[PDB]
Design a binder for these strands. Structure first.
Ligand code: TTP
Ligand code: CA
Ligand code: CA
Ligand code: CA
Ligand code: CA
Ligand code: CA
Ligand code: CL
Length: 901
DNA sequence: TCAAGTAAGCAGTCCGCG
DNA sequence: GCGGACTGCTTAC
């Protein structure tokens, strides 16, 4: 077995390392690590160490780590560059693990825990920790067991033991429906007092010390609460037993306004799952309560109880404990699905960083690039301080608001990383500058050729062509991984569509799902077998196919975020390789590439239609073009096509055989023009959109930049069983618009694109007729709530007070004096509802914490005073009017014109 | 809302616009 | 009432 680190810390002049040894065993060592740093020396000195620019460097070996830090300081006082890895943990891992790390996840202790704390006087502040901890469920990945620590006696109630048999049975039997598949995995431990529970929990922690510590909100609540509670009862030294090296810190953590407190446990890698979810899931939720996310991800029903959570333990301790266990399992289930822990470890070990540093792309890329350079004996530069400066980004084309019947989109593969590689954009590859012409001149190939020797970007930057920079070299490796996993993702997606087709025809039999790998396109034998399968087996296969696709999406999209992170990090002042010359070289080249290809695609299509000046490209954002295919369809049919799938094949054949070769010729020319290192602008067909053949649908529409809808039949080679709506930027896509409204707007769009104007007018009429029956939560807007206490002034809306903030102040006033009423937490999401004039709340809106029912006292009143009229015109009618106006449609008839008869 | 980047939309406040 | 300066929030890349 090859060895791998678990955790690494610097504590004074010692590196503290937990690792897995050659025998598969967890181990700990304290290494008195002697770091090296570098200084420029004259050429006279024969050395093997060179900076990234090829300047000679002398290596400086320090007695300890504090000596290395003092030298960096004194080099600053002198005014000279101190080169090398100043994060000595990273240098240590580089020296100790001088190879590609193969890790074994089965040897890494991943702990998933949740605590319960009964609080009769509001939220229990983790930094006070004044209330007893009365439940801890702690799952261990190695044991595969849920360890339940249950307080039977508290100042808030003496309770009976939790019954495992009641927990197992249905809600309909008096039970808690704790999943069968985990019942045998529960190790249950009741305690007579909190001191006993906490002492036992600390002994347990010692024996099964987390490497990865996760859960929901554990970093902001669970961890600091357990730490401070133990600290209040036993002292600081006992609290510090949560760290394997007995060292903890705070932390702080900004931003403005104001600041939080977390506990840094040295030798643990805390990956709060809420944080993993926000970084990697690529959703924006109305609520981040576990229950909301569990419903969203797993389609599991909200685990319900009577009364408030502060009375739950004394009124129903059985359910209290059972829900603590289910809370932990929920997070494991979301991970089984999303695989964010797996992803974190992959990226973390790849980069050779503390695993928790996957949260910082700057940290991740600094470690990768350092390790790539160290391998060649090259020395990294000192990080400098830079003033934050704005710089330009992508080009977005203004669309003409309209409907568009037949649409084909084309999209550049990993654009920004592909520009890095093509141009050879890197800190050490800068060759100089050239006199820049207006961008428009490069777009039209009218400017003089920038260089005959170097590789250029239209921002004026020239780059070496003899060898690849460290940025191109390393961005390529992660790009190639991204491409691998995207393949598995798209194949899984395609395999899912074959199952959906076969679901049109079971096959009334008792059989089993096929043992297949969904990452690969189903063979003809698997296809045959699928066509003989029951609905039960086919649905189970769909679930599994869709799970593979999710797994592929996680792996692919976050490797993409990482590489896009690097292009972005070039424009972040805290990045070691921060250069605005390079950041702009990427974005300017991208602007040219899009507008260059727009010109070429128009020219091509104008040529192959016999026209001049006609604009076939109707829109583009950053790296995408949207081509109007009406004239291509018109040249053939629609006479003339058997079905929808027939013109979708014709357009797929035309895009792949005629257009892409022309796009590639267009891009090969631009590469020569810029004299780039290698041609890497690959623009594949993305979507084929249009109305169902023979229908009165409009196919798609644009309202403006970054706001559009299309009816897609084929996406990147996935031919759908049913057409899919691709809606971008419109209100159906915003977390802020109500659930019921998003749904309603979506069906309006669907009818517009697939069925026509009259189908739209009948749905709108029906929705307007029934919308007052909708549940208040389903029709409440959502906003994030920043700067509440600023507005307020005091406590009414102050000058320029935002609408949602006003609603919160209304809420604050209606719940004034209540300890147990839910407080609106600053920086979180709220539900917002408009209020009718003359209401007892004395303002036009009320807001409350999202993902929650509003307090029983006031609920009846807001429900009574809810302004449905304002609600409808604001969230539904205004947006819908914007759609139909853009699409040249009416949601209301209109005319009409006969009229009676 | 600690944690790579810019572009650009819409809601609402405030206030002009004879 | 609408739009523009401005803040707040949110999304497309
Ligand atoms: C999504 C996204 C894009 N971008 C920039 C960089 C991208 O190259 C460019 C286009 O974005 P995308 O079209 O979303 O993705 P991509 O071209 O990088 O890769 P692919 O299409 O194969 O999925 O916009 C970011 O800087 N950050 C982001 O989060
Ligand atoms: Ca792209
Ligand atoms: Ca693509
Ligand atoms: Ca069949
Ligand atoms: Ca794109
Ligand atoms: Ca070339
Ligand atoms: Cl790819």
């Amino acid at each position: 077995m090859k060895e791998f680190y678990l955790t690494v810390e610097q504590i004074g002049d010692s590196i503290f390392e937990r690792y897995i040894d050659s025998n598969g065993r967890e181990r700990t060592r304290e290494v008195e690590y002697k770091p090296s740093l570098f200084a420029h020396c004259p050429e006279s000195q024969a050395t093997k160490y060179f900076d990234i620019y090829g300047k000679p460097c002398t290596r400086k070996l320090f007695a300890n780590m504090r000596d290395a830090s003092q030298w960096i300081k004194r080099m600053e006082d002198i005014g000279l560059e101190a080169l090398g890895m100043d994060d000595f943990k990273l240098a240590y891992l580089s020296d100790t693990y001088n190879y590609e790390i193969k890790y074994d996840h089965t040897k890494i202790r991943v702990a998933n825990f949740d605590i319960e704390v009964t609080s009769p006087d509001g939220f229990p502040e983790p930094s006070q920790a004044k209330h007893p901890i009365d439940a801890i469920t702690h799952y261990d990945s190695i044991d595969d067991r849920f360890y339940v620590f249950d307080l039977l006696n508290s100042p808030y109630g003496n309770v009976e033991e939790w019954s495992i048999e009641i927990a197992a049975k249905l809600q309909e039997q008096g039970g808690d429906e704790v999943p069968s598949e985990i019942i045998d995995k529960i190790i249950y431990m009741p305690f007579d007092n909190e001191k006993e529970l906490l002492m036992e929990y600390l002994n347990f922690w010692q024996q099964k010390t987390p490497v990865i510590l996760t859960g929901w909100n554990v970093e902001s609540f669970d961890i600091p609460y357990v730490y401070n509670r133990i600290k209040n009862i036993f002292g600081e030294s006992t609290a510090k037993r949560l760290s394997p090296h007995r060292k903890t810190r705070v932390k702080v953590i900004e931003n403005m306004y104001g600041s939080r407190e977390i506990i840094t446990l040295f030798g643990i890698s805390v990956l709060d799952y809420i944080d993993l979810y926000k970084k990697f899931s690529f959703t924006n939720q109305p609520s981040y309560s576990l229950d909301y996310i569990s419903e969203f991800e797993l389609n599991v029903g909200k685990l319900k109880y009577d009364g408030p959570i502060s009375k739950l333990r004394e009124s129903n301790h059985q359910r209290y404990i059972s829900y603590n266990i289910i809370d932990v399992y929920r997070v494991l289930q979301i991970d089984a699905k999303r695989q964010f822990i797996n992803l974190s470890l992959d990226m973390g070990y790849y980069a050779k960083i503390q695993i928790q540093s996957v949260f910082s792309p700057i940290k991740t890329w600094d470690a990768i690039i350092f390790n790539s350079l160290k391998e060649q004996n090259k020395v990294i530069p000192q990080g400098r301080s830079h003033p934050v400066q704005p710089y330009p980004g992508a080009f977005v084309k203004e669309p003409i608001p309209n409907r568009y019947k037949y649409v084909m989109s084309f999209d550049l593969t990993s654009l920004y990383p592909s520009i890095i590689r093509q141009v050879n954009i890197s800190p050490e590859t800068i060759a100089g500058t050239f006199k820049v012409a207006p961008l428009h001149d490069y777009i039209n190939a009218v400017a003089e050729r920038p260089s005959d020797v170097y590789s250029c970007s239209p921002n004026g930057m020239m780059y070496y062509k003899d060898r690849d920079g460290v940025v191109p070299t390393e961005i390529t490796k992660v790009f190639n991984q991204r491409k691998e996993h995207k393949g598995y993702m798209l194949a899984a997606q395609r395999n899912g569509e074959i199952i959906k087709e076969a679901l049109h025809n079971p096959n009334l039999s008792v059989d089993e799902p096929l043992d297949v790998d969904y990452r690969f396109d189903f063979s003809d034998e698997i296809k045959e077998k699928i066509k003989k399968l029951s609905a039960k087996s086919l649905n189970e296969m769909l679930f599994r196919a869709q799970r593979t696709e999710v797994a592929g999406m996680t792996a692919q999209i976050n490797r993409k975020a990482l590489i896009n992170g690097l292009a972005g990090a070039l424009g972040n002042v805290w990045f070691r390789y921060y250069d605005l010359r390079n950041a702009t070289a990427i974005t300017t080249f991208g602007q040219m590439a899009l507008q260059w290809i727009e010109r070429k695609v128009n020219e091509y299509l104008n040529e192959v239609c016999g026209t001049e000046g006609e604009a076939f490209v109707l829109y583009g954002d950053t790296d995408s073009i949207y081509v109007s295919a009406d004239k291509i369809i018109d040249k053939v049919g629609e006479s003339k096509f058997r079905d929808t799938n027939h013109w979708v094949d014709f357009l797929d054949k035309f895009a792949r055989e005629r257009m892409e070769p022309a796009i590639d010729r267009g891009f090969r020319e631009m590469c020569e023009y810029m004299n780039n290192k290698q041609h890497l602008m690959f623009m594949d067909r993305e979507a084929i959109a249009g109305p169902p053949l023979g229908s009165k649908g409009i196919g798609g529409f644009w309202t403006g930049k970054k706001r559009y809808a299309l009816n897609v039949w084929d996406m990147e080679g996935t031919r759908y069983a049913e057409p899919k709506l691709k809606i971008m930027g419109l209100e159906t896509q915003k977390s802020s618009t109500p659930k019921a409204v998003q749904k309603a707007l979506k069906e309006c769009i669907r009818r517009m694109l697939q069925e026509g104007e009259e189908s739209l007018q009948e749905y709108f009429k029906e929705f307007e007729k029934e919308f007052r029956q909708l549940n208040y939560i389903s029709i409440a807007s959502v906003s994030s709530a920043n700067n509440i206490a600023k507005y307020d002034v005091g406590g009414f809306p102050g000058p320029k007070c935002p609408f949602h903030i006003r609603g919160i102040l209304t809420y604050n006033r209606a719940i004034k004096g209540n300890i147990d009423a839910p407080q609106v937490v600053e920086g979180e999401k709220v539900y917002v509802l408009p209020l009718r004039e003359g209401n007892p709340f004395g303002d036009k809106c009320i807001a409350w914490p999202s993902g929650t029912e509003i307090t029983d006292l006031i609920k009846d009143d807001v429900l009574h005073w809810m302004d449905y009229t304002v609600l409808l015109e604001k969230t539904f009618i205004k947006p819908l009017e914007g759609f139909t106006s853009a699409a040249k449609l009416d949601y209301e008839k209109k005319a009409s014109l006969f009229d009676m008869f």
